[PDB]
């Protein structure tokens, strides 16, 4: 029998579900048919309404302490939580109830990990990441898998690790698997030789743009951003933001929307500053 997974959806754009199904290896079809039991998931599931809620109830009982709770999106605290209504009730109530009896939580993406776009100033809904919502006292692991969205093969790589090796991957201080989040983009970037030579894109579609020069001066946040984009890359290893000519915007880091303009130059670059 296949590990039960409950995949809840809070305030979100659905980019994390979308990324997941892009996985080249394993294929999403094989994850769902043969690896996990995806027992609740708004995007894909047959059931709606009362029949959907009843699945919650049942899984929760039958597999008490034995399901993984995956969370896409996040709970709002303003509007009495009714800026995200599920079954006529605040999404936060759904999240809390299912967290209570999960084995472990996966916080998918920047929404669940940190807050993402809806939490950017002035955060009208008081959108709150999962770990902050559940608080200090929550006693099960919360695996943060950030990015807007995360890379597909990172998402399925976390799940296959857990299924193959029978443990939670080692996490950094922020709760992110060292499997994928223990280097910055800039620590593994193929444009680094240009950075080092002072060879930059200065203006869009200039000489340097056409030669693949470093994107630092046009706002690349790779120096401060931890992710697997420069190593694993995106969409079956096809590209990543920098390869296609736009700087990193910092999308796996807490608070990236309010760090500064995406075209502002990244900080803390000098060891004497």
């Amino acid at each position: 029998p296949r590990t039960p997974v409950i995949w809840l959806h809070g305030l979100e754009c659905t980019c994390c579900s979308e990324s997941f199904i892009r996985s080249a290896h394993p294929l999403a079809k094989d994850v769902v048919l043969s690896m996990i039991s995806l027992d609740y998931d708004d995007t894909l599931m047959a059931a709606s309404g009362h029949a959907a809620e009843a699945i919650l109830d049942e899984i929760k009982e039958k597999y008490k302490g034995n399901y993984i709770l995956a969370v896409e999106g996040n709970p709002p605290l303003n509007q009495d939580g009714m800026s995200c209504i599920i079954g006529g009730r605040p999404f936060s109530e759904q999240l809390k109830r299912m967290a209570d009896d999960a084995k472990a939580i996966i916080s998918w993406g920047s929404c669940a990990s940190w807050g993402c776009v809806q939490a950017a100033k002035p955060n009208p809904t008081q959108a709150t990441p999962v770990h902050k919502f559940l608080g200090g006292g929550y006693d099960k692991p919360i695996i943060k898998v950030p990015g807007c969205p995360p890379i597909a093969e990172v998402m399925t790589g976390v799940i296959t690790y857990m299924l193959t090796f029978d443990r939670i991957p080692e996490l950094d201080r922020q709760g992110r698997p060292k499997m994928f989040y223990s280097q910055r983009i800039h620590d593994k970037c193929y444009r680094r030789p240009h950075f080092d030579a002072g060879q930059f894109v200065e203006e869009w579609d200039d000489e340097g743009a056409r030669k693949g020069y470093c994107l630092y001066k046009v706002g690349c946040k790779g120096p401060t951003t931890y992710n697997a984009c420069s190593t694993v890359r995106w969409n079956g290893g096809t590209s990543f933001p920098i390869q296609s000519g736009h700087g990193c915007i910092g999308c796996s880091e807490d608070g990236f929307w309010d760090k500064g303009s995406f075209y502002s130059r990244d900080t803390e670059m000098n060891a004497f500053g």
């Binding site: 999403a28 027992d39 599931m45 079954g87 006529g88 869009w204 995106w234 933001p241």
Partner: protein, 595 residues
Amino acid sequence: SVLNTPNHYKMDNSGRRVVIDPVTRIEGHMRCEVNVDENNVIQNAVSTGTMWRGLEVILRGRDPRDAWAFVERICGVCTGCHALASVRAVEDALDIKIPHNATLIREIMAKTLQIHDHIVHFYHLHALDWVNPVNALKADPQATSELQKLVSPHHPMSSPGYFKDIQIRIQKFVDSGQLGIFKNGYWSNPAYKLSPEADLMAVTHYLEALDFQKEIVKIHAIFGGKNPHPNYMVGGVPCAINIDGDMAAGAPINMERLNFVKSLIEQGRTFNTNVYVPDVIAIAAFYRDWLYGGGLSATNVMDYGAYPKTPYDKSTDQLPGGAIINGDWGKIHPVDPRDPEQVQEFVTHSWYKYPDETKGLHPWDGITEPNYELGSKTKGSRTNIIEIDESAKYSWIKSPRWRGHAVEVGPLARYILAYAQGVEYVKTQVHTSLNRFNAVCRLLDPNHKDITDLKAFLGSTIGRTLARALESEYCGDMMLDDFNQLISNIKNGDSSTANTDKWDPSSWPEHAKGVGTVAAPRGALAHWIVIEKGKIKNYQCVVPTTWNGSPRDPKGNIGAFEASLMGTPMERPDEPVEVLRTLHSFDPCLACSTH
């Protein structure tokens, strides 16, 4: 109560009430309530958008150049269309013209999105309203193969043994007792009309489409870095081109990357023609007697228009826009997103406040101030809605109207507008599809009488579903054309991708306003920006599902979702397959609707 709406519906909430919350197999969160009469016919329908994030509020004070990335995160399903609208709106406000290759690459990205989104919607969101995977386990693999070969003769994947292997996989899944995404489905409801063989074919294709969809978005990865959420920028595209100059291998776009895009395009064209379009036609024929769900598509449809063969010349739009009103396909009313008397949003039945709530606000004047407040006739409480009070504020979706009219938007709207405007590619698609539909019908019913009435054919949930698939196919052919144009431009000396003359805010006027429109997957999208001294003073989005999913307006007109459900009989009101089937035909994007 019985409300006689100006758009000629009678909303009667005296019958039994049925609540669907959550509406699954959509993007985001929706609640739907209906009332059924003693004959199980829907006589009231209530569309409630159950989420809000406030992107319009969050944007205030920020730099217009950054906006695209914020608004891209309105939606991960229609990923990039908001970025496109945003850069277009800023470019409009600042009088920026972009290079031809930027125009082309943006259109290529837009058509990639259309194809990807449409395919995933039909198979992974919609199909379980028409397909019963448990019944597939009853199919004869050889008869499934015979059906497949008739449905799509060119598709290679028809072996009886292949269908048997698929069936064995689904049987093992069911026999496991862990039914996952199929659990608690309404699989005994007679509303499911496929044969076992058609069910098995469709499940097979669900799996083929799940495998395929990850490929086509590699076009987004090449031009935009990643999918979901590829990058854009104001004034061009970031993916600089260098085919044969110094350091070409390290440029975003080089010969090898172009070859890759070519390959991806052709793979998408083939899947459209050999899998997706034939399946929608065939499923339609099995459902030939189920012609509910036309709603407003019979009367009032709108799109801004898209894909001009000559950049910046809308008379060349390959999906030409306008508005058809009161069913008169002979009169295309011009739509101007700049005219304050045209697009207006009301909030009378929405969870927002205006200083004068009698007003509909054009989006340059728009206001987004949350006001979660339930009507005094609500059953339940503020944090436990049992039956929503649709006489008061009942949705996070604003109510957009066009000259006071409620309209339907989406692929179907575009197909009616294109047909009516003489777009020969579309006319051919519609006529050939009708002919194919009738042929599959006669396969199934040898006494079939051909359907000839296009209004009836297109103006239905089936028609809405078909138009989406046909649009996918058209987008693939257009994207190929775009690619060939890109190649020709490069060949003739033009590898340029960005205009930077107005990149620096010092070059901007102190006050400026702009609007950007897109033919998004779900219909008419626009963003309206007001810039003041370098910063966003107002930013208002009106998105396709805002139109379709709209709650009522002050005069009582109902929106496209609510209209589509009216008059529909249900086999089992408490297993509301028909409601899901029709709502899903609009491809609701609720995160988009509310932003």
